[PDB]
Every structure is written in C-alpha cells, then in structure tokens.
Design a protein around this ligand. Structure first.
Ligand SMILES: *[C@@H]1O[C@H](CO)[C@@H](O[C@@H]2O[C@H](CO)[C@@H](O)[C@H](O)[C@H]2NC(C)=O)[C@H](O)[C@H]1NC(C)=O
Ligand SMILES: *[C@@H]1O[C@H](CO)[C@@H](O[C@@H]2O[C@H](CO)[C@@H](O)[C@H](O)[C@H]2NC(C)=O)[C@H](O)[C@H]1NC(C)=O
Ligand SMILES: *[C@@H]1O[C@H](CO)[C@@H](O[C@@H]2O[C@H](CO)[C@@H](O)[C@H](O)[C@H]2NC(C)=O)[C@H](O)[C@H]1NC(C)=O
Ligand SMILES: *[C@@H]1O[C@H](CO)[C@@H](O)[C@H](O)[C@H]1NC(C)=O
Ligand SMILES: *[C@@H]1O[C@H](CO)[C@@H](O)[C@H](O)[C@H]1NC(C)=O
Ligand SMILES: *[C@@H]1O[C@H](CO)[C@@H](O)[C@H](O)[C@H]1NC(C)=O
Ligand SMILES: *[C@@H]1O[C@H](CO)[C@@H](O)[C@H](O)[C@H]1NC(C)=O
Ligand SMILES: *[C@@H]1O[C@H](CO)[C@@H](O)[C@H](O)[C@H]1NC(C)=O
Ligand SMILES: *[C@@H]1O[C@H](CO)[C@@H](O)[C@H](O)[C@H]1NC(C)=O
Ligand SMILES: *[C@@H]1O[C@H](CO)[C@@H](O)[C@H](O)[C@H]1NC(C)=O
Ligand SMILES: *[C@@H]1O[C@H](CO)[C@@H](O)[C@H](O)[C@H]1NC(C)=O
Ligand SMILES: *[C@@H]1O[C@H](CO)[C@@H](O)[C@H](O)[C@H]1NC(C)=O
Lengths: 287, 287, 287
C-alpha cells in the first residue's frame, strides 16, 4: 500500500547515495592523478617553486654557530625589551646563556677542524626577544677582527639529534653562514626561509638584515685595546617564508585544473555523442 | 501570420536571456560560497599567505622616525640624482627638510619616554630620490655611536592622522625598526612589504639592505672629534611587496576551484541519473 | 557479412576521433582566449606580479661594475672554498682575474663621465665560489672611503653584446647599485631577482645581504696608511627569484579558470534548455 508511495523517497535517498558515491569516485580519481603529478614532479630536477608566508607567534629558538676559535664569550643575556641596557665592556660574567661547544670538519675544508659554539637564539618575536652575545679577543695575526656564525633551524632539534657532527656539517652546507664584524655591534635581524626539497626534506635558510653600529672606544677606556666583538640576534619578521614546488605547495589549484580537465573530457565526449547523432541525421537526410 | 515565424527568434532571445540569468545565478552562488570561504578564513589564525609584487612608479613618501635624543640634525636635503654632492661636515644648515618632533612612550618600555624626529623620505624611485640626513653628537656615555630609526608607511598619513602618539606606538610595534651606525654613512636602500592582516588591516613592514661606508676623518680635520652621524635613505626597488591570505589575494583561482566543484557536483548528479537509468534497465532485464 | 559487426568498432574509433578533435577544438579555443588575456595584460601598466623561485645548480657569472676611479685593483682571485686564505695587504699582484674597463656617462648624471671596471663574479654556488677583490687608494678629498659597484645579470652577455656603453647605462638604470665601504672587508652575499616586464624584457635586480667586517690595522702595520678596500662577492642562495605577471607566469591556473568558464557557459546553456522544456511543460499544463 504505502510502499508504492515511499518508493519515491527510497529512490531519492538512493539517488543522493549515487551523487555521493560518484563524488567519491571522481575525488579518488583526481587524487590518484594528482598523486601521479606530484610523484613525477619529484622525479625532475629544479622545479619552479612558489613562495608562501606563514605568520608565526613564537619562533623555534634557533642555533647560532658562532666560530670564535681563539676568542671567548664575554656575556650572553636574552633581553625581552627592544633595548639592551647599559653594559660593562671588557668585563666577563653574566653569561646567562645555554651554549654548547661542538667540533667538526668543514666539508669544503675537509682538512681544517674548527670549533663551534652554539646559542639558543631568540624565539619570542612579538615580545622582541633578542640575545646579546658579547665577545673578546687578544690581538692575533688574523688581519681581520672577524668570527663567523651559522644559523640553523632549531636548537631543540640540535639537542635532540644524534650525531651532532654530521648535522653540523649539514647545517654548514646550508646557505646561511655569515661573518659579523669585530670592534662594534652588529644587530642581526635574521629571518627564516624554509624550502622544501624535491625529495621532501625541509631545508632551512636565513636572511639577515644586519645593522652595524660603531663601538665608542671611550667606553672601554683601557690600555688593553683588545678587539672585542658584539652581536644582537633577533627576529626581523614573524612571517616564516616557506617555499615548495609550485604545484605541491598549492594543490587546490592543480586539482582545480584536474577537475576542469576531467569535466572537459566528459563534456566533450557528450558533445561528441551529440555530433555523432548530428552526423547520423545528416546521413539519414541523404537516404 | 508572420508571428509564427518570428516565434523562433523570440524563443532564441528568451533562450539567451535564460543563458545569462542562469549565468548570473551561478555567479551569485559562487560569490556567496566564496564570501563564506573568506569570512571563515578570517576567523582562523595564521593563514598561509601568498606573495605579490606591484611595480610602482612613485612611492608614498614614508616617515623616518629618527631617534637622535641628545643628538641634533645637521643637514637634510633630498637629492634627485644618485650622487649626494660634496658636503661640509660638522657645519649645520641646509636643513631643506620637512620634519616633525613627536614624543611618546614605547609600549615595550612603558616607562621610558623617547623623543622622535620624522622625515619625509624619498618618494620618486625612478628619479633615484634619496634623502641625506646628517647628524652630530657631542661625546656621551652611551658607549655606542648609535641612534635608532623606524620606518612607517606614509608621511602624509602621519600628517593627516589624529592621535599621533598612538599611531607612533603602533608603527613602533611594527617590525621595521633599525639602528644606523655613527661615525660613517649608512646608505639605506629600503623597500616596502604591505601585509594584509586577517582582520583586514594593511600592516606595512620595510626591508632595508644597508651599505655602510666609512667616513674619512680627514674630512672633519678638527680637534672637536664629536661622533657625527650620516644616512642616505632611498628606495631599493619599485616593487612594493604586498602579501595577503593565499585565497583572498588570488580569488580567481579559488573561484575556479569552486566552479569546478559546482560543475562536478552537477555533472556527477547527471551521471548518477544515468546510472539510475542503467540500474533500472538491469532490473528490467531480470523481469 | 562481417562488415555489419565491424561497424561497431568503426563507430567506436570514429567516436574516439570525435573526442580528440573536440578536445583539440576546445584547447585551441582556451588557447586563443588566454592569448587574448595575455595580450591585454601587456597593454596595461603595473600588473600585480607573482613570485617564483627556481633552484639553480650553477649561476651565470655576473658583472661587478666596480667604480674605483682614482683607486686601483690590488688583487682579484676566485676561491672555491668558503675561506679566503691569508693575504699580504698593501702588496699588488695575484690579479688572477678577467676584468674590463669601460667608460660611459650616467643617464642621471648626463654630464659626468665615470670609469667602470668589470669582474666575472662567482658562478659556482654549491662549490661556494667567491671572488675577493682587494683595492688601494692614496688619500683623496672624497671625505668618504667609498667606491660604488653595480651588478648586472651575466658577464658573458656583456662580452657578447655590442654597444657596451648603452648596455652599461641600461644596467646602471637598474636598481642594483651599491657602495661598499673602504677600510674593511664587505662580504657581499648577493642574490638575483629576474623580473619580466610587461613588454617581455627580463629585467634583473640583485638583493645583497652584506656583512662588513673590520680590517685590523695591525696587518698593514705601515706608515703609508692609505685607505684600501676589500670585497668578497658570492651567491647567497641558489634560488634565482623570478617574477612575472600573475597570470602569465602561472598560466595553468588562468587556463583552469577559463575551462571552468567555458564549461560553465556550456552547462548553464544545457540547464537553460532544460528550463525551456520545463516552461513549455508548464505552459502545456495551462492548455
Ligand atoms: C674542540 O676544539 C678546541 C679547539 O678547536 C679544543 O680546545 C682545546 O681544549 C683543551 C682542553 O681540553 C685545551 O687544553 C686546549 O688549549 C684547547 N685548544 C687550543 C688550541 O687552545 C677542544 O678541546 C676540542 N674539544 C671540545 C670538546 O671542545
Ligand atoms: C619631547 O621630549 C624632548 C626630550 O625627550 C623635550 O626636549 C626638551 O625641550 C625643552 C624645550 O621646551 C628643553 O628646554 C629641554 O632641555 C629638552 N630636554 C632635554 C633633556 O634637553 C621636548 O620638550 C619634548 N616635547 C616636544 C614637543 O618636543
Ligand atoms: C676611461 O676613463 C679613464 C678615467 O675616467 C681614463 O683614464 C686615463 O687613462 C689615460 C691613459 O690613456 C691616463 O693617461 C690618464 O691619466 C687617465 N685619467 C686620469 C684622470 O688619470 C681612460 O683613458 C678612459 N678610457 C679607457 C679606455 O679606459
Ligand atoms: C639566568 O637568569 C635567570 C633569570 O630568570 C635566573 O633564574 C638564572 O638563575 C640565571 N642563570 C644563571 C646561570 O645565573
Ligand atoms: C676529503 O678528505 C679525504 C681524506 O680522508 C680525501 O680522501 C677526499 O678526497 C677529500 N674529498 C674532497 C672532496 O676534498
Ligand atoms: C688577554 O690579555 C689580558 C691582559 O690584560 C689577560 O688578562 C687575559 O687573560 C688574556 N686573555 C686570555 C684568554 O688569556
Ligand atoms: C629648499 O629648497 C627649495 C629648492 O627648490 C627652495 O625652494 C626652498 O626655499 C628651500 N627651503 C628652505 C627652507 O630654504
Ligand atoms: C604599563 O605601565 C602601567 C603603568 O601605568 C602598568 O600598570 C602596566 O602593568 C604596564 N604594562 C606592561 C605590559 O608593562
Ligand atoms: C658641542 O661642542 C661644541 C664645542 O665646539 C659646541 O660648539 C656645541 O655647541 C656643542 N653642542 C651643543 C648641542 O651644545
Ligand atoms: C690564474 O690561476 C690559474 C690557476 O688554475 C692559472 O692557470 C692561470 O695561469 C692564472 N692566471 C695568471 C694570469 O697568472
Ligand atoms: C642630457 O644632456 C643633453 C646634452 O647633450 C641635454 O640636451 C639634455 O637636456 C640632458 N637631459 C637630461 C634629462 O638632463
Ligand atoms: C701611493 O703612494 C705610494 C707611497 O708609498 C706610492 O708608492 C704609490 O705609487 C702611490 N700610488 C699611485 C697610484 O701612484
């Protein structure tokens, strides 16, 4: 009796189930062909990459592979406010810092062993956290008051990574080395750029806009006169700049093109069936 | 008589009206769902943003919140050509400049009141306009020949904005502060990056590539020997770098995905009706 | 006999030929309308451009338009390793370099003739190639130990370009000039940004993150005391940053939108035919 009437609603619910099953079939189809696109993009070298910024509230505290060598750290003290207060130059102490000394061999050197110091840099951008590393060095024949410094992604990873020697060589091969001057401060407003490799590894690079400021020799005011170094590391922007393959990093566009492509193939097949019918009518007109 | 023949053209014009009304319906549909997408993207925090350059012929003259404090401006003179001509160091005058002195409290300080000077920076990029601000400072205990400087979007806005104290605190919270050295020029080839917030406010940041050049003490050649400061502000590139939410800044792509989505739902519903007919034929084959 | 049976396969092959011919027709259609979009985008001024990185294994060795003028080059020697070894300051020789001296008139000057030196900069990024140009200059009245330097795309082009004067003026109009200090090294980790103009010309710009490091006067240790200059040019990143019109540089997205548009017009026309049939049924219900 009422089954004949409820057959309409049953057919309607079966119809919506058909809608959604064909949606899921089309979705898995575009998913598979897009996975094929991605796994082919992987196989090729040097793909045109996009750019993408991701505003971050607090960074991951990075490493600062200072290369003092013969020099020594004189003071390390984070400073929330944007102003590092008055100091006492040439006087050690106040090394309120979390450092590690690591030795390794530079791959490009492969014959020179250099000693590296590490520092947990600033991680609170909005708070304007900045680490002030003050150094000192008695006169040497280096002809240049210079010590280098690297910058890798996160210090927590360097703590929680085995084989720190190899990871240090890896972060040395990275394009984020720099040499801050000796004899005056070098405010280093670093910023991060995370590139995703074709293999998938998240290689990181930094992009620092230094601002050197002279060091008044009236402050030391001593007959010691040893080249003493200063840095202020802080984050320029809260926009971590990640880049990846143009298609992979913005999939919702290549999948849009793939839906366009499949729908166009479908539609053009429907139009071709219509054209077959039209040609059949034209042939029947000949008789 | 002829009405029966003109009925064909009437039906054709009504048909094209149907084409365009269904186009406008589909357009308002994708517009509404895309507005929903945007107003949801607003609700979330830290969305992956795109990047976009917009070549500009003439910039808006920006503010340069110089923080001399105890120091004083010695000369300000724009220079169209790429070369600032020979000067007379240590001699005031020629302050051919449009400055304003503003006092406020730094939010991170909140207990230190600092005095700020403002300068209408260069706005003609192609002409290579560059403002040369020359300073001077008698010896202090600051231990560092340093005065800071900010950079906000436009000086015309700072003129036409009420409550300059609050706007100055806001532009101070921005990530565009810098400290140019004292004792030698600091060519500051600044460039602008306008980020659009999730709320919609157009936050601006600068990205300066300084190039410090030493100041030959043979030029002053006086027993005064006061740390005197120099800057040359100019625009690096004419490409103002604006960034916004990946979807919002490039809508023509997410709307393309939405047209793909609606057309795919339509088509898959048509295919599901075809499958219903096929299943009905299969059931009729059973009898 | 068997022709009646093979007619099915013949119709099927003709059908697939219809599929592909209508695909090619639709493809040429979207190609033509997209070419129209591009040739209109050309006609307009200042289009919002995208950004795109392209990892490069070896750069094209660029020119370094050093402007010493009265000064002189003291040593030029590429160095694969990341370390320039110990030197002998103030002593000429070892100019293991490929330079050219070119004279021209600065367009903004148009009355001052300046002499330019060119250097084949580093081109091997992964090898960390870096050119160290050491200079010297006896005391002058320039009041500033400064000599400028430009950076254009490739030195091979400057060798293989006629009218080097005009090309030098063109690369001078480019936004890639800089002034490295005198009296201490200036490590210049340059990087390249190739912008594609609306006309189509591939304008190049550089983006250098210098890192000045002081020059210990204990190394010269002579009563000569002439301001002598130092630079170390190397590539910051292997990601050449090319930018072009938002649509032109990423066509596969605007063509996706165009396929969406054409398919939507088609579908909405089909739906309008269905609505015509529905209105005809509604009118027949009136009788
Ligand atoms: C890492 O290398 C540094 C030098 O590059 C080593 O420093 C030496 O440390 C010992 C202490 O055991 C001192 O007696 C030596 O005088 C130091 N060398 C010099 C040249 O002064 C250091 O030992 C190495 N290992 C570690 C773990 O730091
Ligand atoms: C803004 O602050 C500055 C100092 O930060 C004030 O400078 C003082 O100006 C008065 C003039 O009325 C002088 O007599 C004082 O000597 C200045 N101070 C110092 C420490 O020298 C200034 O008055 C404040 N207001 C304005 C509008 O600039
Ligand atoms: C390019 O300009 C430079 C100066 O800007 C010229 O240098 C002169 O070279 C001659 C050699 O023929 C010397 O006798 C002069 O003393 C140099 N000038 C000065 C001021 O010292 C140079 O000749 C010009 N042409 C070329 C091809 O370099
Ligand atoms: C570093 O400073 C903090 C301030 O909160 C203090 O608690 C800590 O003991 C200091 N570390 C050393 C080694 O003095
Ligand atoms: C690195 O050093 C080793 C010595 O153990 C040597 O055999 C190898 O050739 C060197 N490689 C390079 C690239 O210099
Ligand atoms: C550097 O010289 C000073 C001389 O005042 C001396 O006190 C200090 O110990 C020396 N540095 C080192 C690391 O020995
Ligand atoms: C600044 O220079 C311009 C040059 O056009 C001149 O007209 C103006 O009077 C000068 N201002 C002052 C205060 O001398
Ligand atoms: C700012 O200063 C006021 C004093 O009026 C104080 O009450 C407030 O706690 C301070 N805020 C911060 C964040 O230091
Ligand atoms: C700085 O000292 C000089 C001494 O020659 C003096 O003329 C000048 O007035 C002083 N500066 C100020 C701001 O008083
Ligand atoms: C430069 O150095 C290379 C080292 O391979 C050498 O072959 C060449 O002769 C040198 N050039 C000059 C002019 O000495
Ligand atoms: C460039 O110099 C020429 C002299 O031959 C002069 O006629 C012309 O007006 C100048 N152009 C500019 C823009 O200064
Ligand atoms: C600079 O002066 C020195 C004096 O020792 C002289 O030997 C040298 O030739 C001078 N430079 C030039 C370019 O004449």
């Amino acid at each position: 009796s009422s089954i004949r009437f409820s057959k309409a609603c049953l057919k309607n619910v079966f119809s919506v189930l058909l809608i959604f099953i064909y949606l899921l079939l089309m979705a898995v189809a575009v998913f598979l062909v897009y996975r094929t696109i991605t796994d082919f993009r992987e196989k090729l070298k040097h793909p045109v990459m996009s750019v993408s910024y991701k505003e971050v509230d607090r960074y991951d505290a990075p490493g600062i592979a200072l290369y003092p060598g013969q020099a020594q750290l004189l003071s390390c003290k984070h400073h929330y406010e944007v102003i590092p207060p008055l100091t006492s130059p040439g006087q050690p102490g106040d090394m309120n810092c979390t450092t590690q000394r690591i030795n390794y061999t530079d791959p490009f050197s492969n014959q020179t062993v250099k000693s590296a110091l590490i520092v947990q840099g600033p991680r609170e951008v909005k708070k304007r956290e900045l680490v002030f590393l003050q150094f000192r060095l008695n006169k040497s024949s280096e002809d240049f008051s210079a010590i280098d410094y690297l910058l890798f992604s996160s210090f927590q990873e360097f703590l929680q990574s085995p084989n720190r020697v190899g990871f240090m060589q890896a972060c040395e091969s990275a394009y984020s080395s720099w040499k801050f001057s000796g004899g005056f401060r070098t405010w280093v407003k670093m910023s991060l750029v995370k590139t995703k490799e074709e293999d998938g590894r998240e290689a990181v690079e930094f992009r620092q806009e230094t601002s050197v400021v002279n060091y008044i020799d009236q402050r030391p005011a001593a007959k010691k006169s040893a080249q003493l170094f200063f840095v202020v590391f802080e984050w320029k922007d809260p926009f971590i700049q990640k880049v990846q393959d143009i298609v992979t990093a913005n999939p919702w566009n290549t999948i849009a093109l793939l839906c366009g492509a499949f729908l166009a193939l479908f539609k053009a097949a429907e139009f071709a069936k219509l054209s077959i019918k039209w040609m059949i009518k034209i042939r029947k007109r000949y008789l």
